[PDB]
Design a protein around this motif. Structure first.
Motif, short mmCIF file in Angstrom:
data_model
loop_
_atom_site.label_atom_id
_atom_site.label_comp_id
_atom_site.label_asym_id
_atom_site.label_seq_id
_atom_site.Cartn_x
_atom_site.Cartn_y
_atom_site.Cartn_z
N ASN A 293 26.94 -16.78 -4.67
CA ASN A 293 25.84 -15.95 -5.15
C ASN A 293 25.68 -16.13 -6.66
O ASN A 293 26.65 -16.02 -7.42
N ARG A 294 24.45 -16.41 -7.08
CA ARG A 294 24.15 -16.78 -8.46
C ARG A 294 23.45 -15.63 -9.17
O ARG A 294 22.51 -15.04 -8.64
N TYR A 295 23.92 -15.32 -10.38
CA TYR A 295 23.21 -14.39 -11.25
C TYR A 295 23.58 -14.71 -12.70
O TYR A 295 24.28 -15.68 -12.98
N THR A 296 23.08 -13.88 -13.61
CA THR A 296 23.30 -14.08 -15.04
C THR A 296 23.76 -12.78 -15.68
O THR A 296 23.24 -11.70 -15.38
N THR A 297 24.74 -12.89 -16.58
CA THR A 297 25.22 -11.76 -17.37
C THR A 297 25.13 -12.12 -18.84
O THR A 297 25.01 -13.29 -19.21
N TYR A 298 25.19 -11.10 -19.69
CA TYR A 298 25.06 -11.29 -21.13
C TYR A 298 26.27 -10.69 -21.84
O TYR A 298 26.76 -9.63 -21.46
N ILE A 299 26.75 -11.39 -22.86
CA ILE A 299 27.84 -10.87 -23.68
C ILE A 299 27.22 -10.02 -24.79
O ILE A 299 26.56 -10.56 -25.68
N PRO A 300 27.41 -8.70 -24.77
CA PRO A 300 26.78 -7.85 -25.78
C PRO A 300 27.33 -8.09 -27.18
O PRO A 300 26.57 -8.36 -28.12
N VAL A 301 28.65 -8.02 -27.31
CA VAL A 301 29.34 -8.21 -28.58
C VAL A 301 30.51 -9.15 -28.31
O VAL A 301 31.01 -9.26 -27.19
N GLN A 302 30.92 -9.86 -29.36
CA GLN A 302 32.01 -10.82 -29.25
C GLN A 302 33.24 -10.16 -28.62
O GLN A 302 33.75 -9.16 -29.12
N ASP A 303 33.70 -10.74 -27.51
CA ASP A 303 34.81 -10.21 -26.74
C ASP A 303 36.03 -11.09 -26.95
O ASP A 303 35.94 -12.31 -26.76
N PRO A 304 37.17 -10.53 -27.35
CA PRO A 304 38.37 -11.35 -27.57
C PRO A 304 39.24 -11.56 -26.35
O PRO A 304 40.20 -12.34 -26.44
N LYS A 305 38.97 -10.91 -25.22
CA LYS A 305 39.89 -10.94 -24.09
C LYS A 305 39.26 -11.41 -22.78
O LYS A 305 39.96 -11.50 -21.77
N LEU A 306 37.95 -11.70 -22.76
CA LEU A 306 37.31 -12.05 -21.49
C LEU A 306 37.90 -13.33 -20.92
O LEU A 306 38.15 -13.44 -19.72
N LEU A 307 38.14 -14.33 -21.79
CA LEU A 307 38.68 -15.59 -21.32
C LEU A 307 40.12 -15.44 -20.84
O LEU A 307 40.54 -16.16 -19.93
N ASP A 308 40.88 -14.52 -21.43
CA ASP A 308 42.23 -14.25 -20.94
C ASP A 308 42.21 -13.85 -19.48
O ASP A 308 42.91 -14.44 -18.65
#
Lengths: 107, 63, 135, 63, 63, 63, 63, 63
Positions: free
Chosen positions: H35-50
């Motif tokens: 299932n395909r969709y799109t999300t947006y990063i509101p502010v720089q996140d330091p832990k999402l990639l972790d």
């Protein structure tokens, strides 16, 4: 001035409370309310939502004060909510705010 | 309406906001009681996003 | 009519809302961890659109969570853990669904989901676990 | 009035500050006795906003 | 004059600098013996501002 | 002559560099044996400046 | 031929590449079996340098 | 189809995402059921990639 009459508004009141038998319970509550007669909602009390939140917290504290810990945990979860809703309705009566109460539910 | 950043943080810590649309520095806050206002981020706050996600607050970015 | 009439689309298909792990207290203070899901449909599209600001699905899911947690806890409070596990007809789930659909006071109770534009069609429990110490 | 950043800090920790408005690098500082003086940030300080918030100091963003 | 960054570091560790004026990239250092010189930052150092504060060194920003 | 960053950091831990002139993206480096070379930060690393300061290695910025 | 960043991470976790030529976002990677490709960093990743340094993978920058 | 940031992190923690096409702030998200969709990063996140690498999802970048 537009007032969002139809929408259902939500409120959360939680706190550490003292029971009847000198015991301490972590309690949370949710309250869902509507607004009617917007003139009352606009020209009676400053920030009616905050006043209702404070009244809800006071009513919850008063209700939990009377009952014991174990009954609150297990058996009283129905009479607690029934008493809290009635106490909140009686408390917000003098304010004559436009808010009407839909449901008080114990979390 | 404009509401101060510290007041907004006190509000979110007290479980009063529901969704927050973040547009750069500007933030459009919607409270749980269907009241909307706007605040601005003073400086880069790393703890802001963690505080928002921890308190079960909807967070929405924008193009 | 262009530039005057807008359109809002509400899906009439049954929506499924699942609840994450949460702790419930039985009659003997035995803590349980319950996973349950609910299936709901929109009954009155206009009433549902009015009750939830903009007709957003998350806003209705929030109210459904708030009520369902209360009714489920109130039902579990009177029951034994053995009564819950040995239950196979889903009597408590059916009673919870009936309470959610018809509230307590052609009159419609304000605390019922019928007062909103939501109809609950099924409530089921997925798994019942114990705290790691008890396990 | 221009006041340097250090004494602004030990005024903050000694809670003589009431409201601080940060448009850019500069901060419009108001004391508890309603005396206001501008301060300039030397370099970005991640601990600055945290220290300001913990001391219960009113913080105001700018458009 | 010009002074190495490590020289400034060990200098402020031994507590003989008094005033440090930060203009973005540049630093204008004032000694305890009324000696003024210039230092440059290699790369953004978060520990710099903390170190200057903990040793009671005046820090002054610029517009 | 250009020297690899991994070799650079290992050589710094070997205490064989004396001066490092850092130009933003660039670094101009002098070995203890008067050998001159040039290296590059792959991506911003504060641990670089920490390692050079703890190794008593001269660090030089420029206007 | 382009390779996923995640796949790059479990591949280097297995000690299988030797060189990492970092050019801003994109990285030129050669494995231990002389296979060369390009990988892209999604966002800024501080742990990248620490992981690459810990596992004896050589890194080289670009002008 | 646009999906908010908080629910996207909830899905990531609940393991219903396979690969993430990160393009700047935009994140093109594919669920485990394609299932395909799109999300947006509101502010720089330091832990999402972790969390993304912890849950072992194929993250990619875009030129």
């Amino acid at each position: 001035k537009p007032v969002n009459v139809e929408a259902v508004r939500e409120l959360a009141a939680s706190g550490v409370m003292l029971t009847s038998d000198e015991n301490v319970v972590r309690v949370e509550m949710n309250v869902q309310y509507r607004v009617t007669n917007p003139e009352k909602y606009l020209y009676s009390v400053t920030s009616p939502d905050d006043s209702l939140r404070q009244a809800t917290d006071s009513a919850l504290r008063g209700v939990i004060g009377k009952y014991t810990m174990d009954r609150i945990l297990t058996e009283g979860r129905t009479v607690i909510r029934s008493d809290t809703q009635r106490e909140l309705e009686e408390t917000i009566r003098p304010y004559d705010m436009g808010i009407t109460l839909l449901d008080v539910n114990f979390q | 309406r404009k509401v101060d950043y510290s007041t907004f943080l006190q509000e979110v810590n007290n479980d009063q906001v529901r969704e927050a649309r973040i547009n750069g520095r500007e933030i459009n806050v919607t409270k749980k009681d269907s009241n909307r206002y706007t605040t601005y981020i003073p400086v880069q706050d790393p703890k802001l996003l963690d505080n928002l996600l921890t308190k079960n607050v909807k967070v929405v970015g924008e193009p | 009519i262009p530039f005057i009439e807008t359109v809002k689309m509400l899906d009439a298909r049954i929506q499924t809302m699942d609840n994450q792990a949460d702790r419930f207290v039985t009659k003997e203070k035995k803590d349980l961890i319950v996973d349950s899901y609910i299936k709901w449909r929109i009954s009155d599209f206009s009433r549902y659109y009015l009750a939830t600001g903009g007709g957003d699905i998350s806003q209705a899911e929030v109210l459904l969570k708030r009520k369902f947690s209360d009714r489920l806890r109130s039902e579990i409070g009177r029951l034994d853990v053995k009564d819950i596990v040995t239950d196979s007809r889903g009597r408590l789930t059916l009673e919870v669904r009936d309470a959610l659909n018809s509230g307590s006071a052609p009159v419609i109770n304000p605390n019922s989901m019928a007062a909103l534009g939501i109809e609950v069609v099924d409530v089921r429990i997925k798994q019942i676990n114990l705290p790691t110490e008890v396990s």
